Amino acid sequence: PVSPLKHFVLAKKAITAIFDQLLEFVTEGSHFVEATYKNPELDRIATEDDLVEMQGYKDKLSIIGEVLSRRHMKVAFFGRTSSGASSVINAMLWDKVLPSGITNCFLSVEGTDGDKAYLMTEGSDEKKSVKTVNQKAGCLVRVFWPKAKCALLRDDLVLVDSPGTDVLDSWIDKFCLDADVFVLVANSESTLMNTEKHFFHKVNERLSKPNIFILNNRWDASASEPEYMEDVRRQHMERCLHFLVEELKVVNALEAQNRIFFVSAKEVLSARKQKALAEGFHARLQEFQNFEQIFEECISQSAVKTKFEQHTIRAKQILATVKNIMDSVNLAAEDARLPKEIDQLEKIQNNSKLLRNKAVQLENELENFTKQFLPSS
């Protein structure tokens, strides 16, 4: 009932918060180390190498927080014209966000904070019209739709439509590695082609266990028929299971059950846009809904790990080195001198212990962050 996407948005705000505190802390600590090293009436209590380390960390953390900021979930769709990739996307959103072709470029869909749809094309910041004015290697058109109308877009998801995998070459995927999920939209009136497989083979080789879903769309055209339906499904199931589990070897048999879905995107869209019956419209709609719920669980989870974990790790290492540096200052300062110099060294002692204690606080919070958002810690 709570969109599983919220898991990603919550992790995002938590990890950006932590890295805010993180940058503040290492900035303060750099000043301290810098003060101590440049103080001319001390003898190497803090060193130039201590200083350079901290300055490096300050600069490193600055732009991690900047890329965390821009991180989002991405799902990419592929299919022959016309298994209905665009109708699948339009139905996940609840409107005809993508009319109606078609043109050789990737089509992504993002949310705007505004109220009006519009377009943008490579190397221009002009917001071109709603889509009306819609139509030398790869071409991307970014479509923007109001967040207030689609929960998916509000919750940090980008959907990408490829041009028909039917119609030319394959150095495409540098639009496509950002993607946390790839979805093959199949034509259930036909059979899984090798041209369809060929693309996901070249995705499998450059990505370790990518998440792949197969939508056998157009599942209307096999309606009306109770016995016929189960027999054709079993046959599509075999080719889909075989492809994922054995050809792509990207998922085991029992997992693959929750990667393959029989669906009617036309129906779902029509039913969803009508909010201001064929044979088995309800069962299919439920099925599209189960897909959404599993998809959202899968993308949110995967996206947190691949986009947030390593930065979390990096932060832990950084906090370790700053603790070692504080300790080193505290200890060096512990080692005859006047009672004027003695209380200067004591001031430095407890400033280092304070700095060191916050580092430990921030390690707590980071640990805390991996428990809530990164099993199995």
Write out the residues near ligand GTP by the rule CB under 6 A: 82, 84-87, 99-102, 217-218, 220-221, 264-266
- Give the helix/strand (H/E) hosting 144: strand 140-146
Nearer to ligand GTP, 22 or 107 (CB): 107
Secondary structure element (H or E) that encloses residue 181, with its range? strand 181-187
Residue 32 vs 145, nearer CB to ligand GTP: 145
Cα angle vertex 95, ends 92, 99, to 5°?
105
Q: Mark out the alpha helices in the chain (DSSP H runs).
A: 6-38, 48-70, 85-92, 151-154, 194-204, 226-241, 253-256, 265-273, 281-304, 310-333, 339-373
Q: Which is nearer to ligand GTP, 131 or 307 (CB)?
A: 131
| Shortest Cβ 135–ligand GTP spacing (Å) | 12
| Closest separation in Å from C-beta 300 to ligand GTP | 26
State in angstroms the smallest separation of the CB of 158 from ligand GTP.
19
Beta bridge partners of 212: 182
Q: How far is the CB of 289 from ligand GTP (least distance, A)?
A: 15
Residue 100 vs 124, nearer CB to ligand GTP: 100
Q: Which residue is at the shortest CB distance from ligand GTP?
A: 82
Q: How far is the CB of 263 from ligand GTP (least distance, A)?
A: 7
Place of tokens 């832990």: 316
Q: Give the other-Cβ count within 10 Å of 309's Cβ.
A: 14
**Which is closer to ligand GTP, CB of 87 or CB of 108?**
87
Which residue's CB is nearer to ligand GTP, number 36 or number 162?
162
Cβ(260)–Cβ(240) below 8 Å: yes
Neighbours of 291 (CB within 10 A): 22
Instruction: Report residue 35 as tokens.
Output: 């003060």
Least separation, in Å, of the C-beta of 265 and ligand GTP? 4
Angle made by CA atoms 110, 122, 62, in degrees to the nearest 5: 70
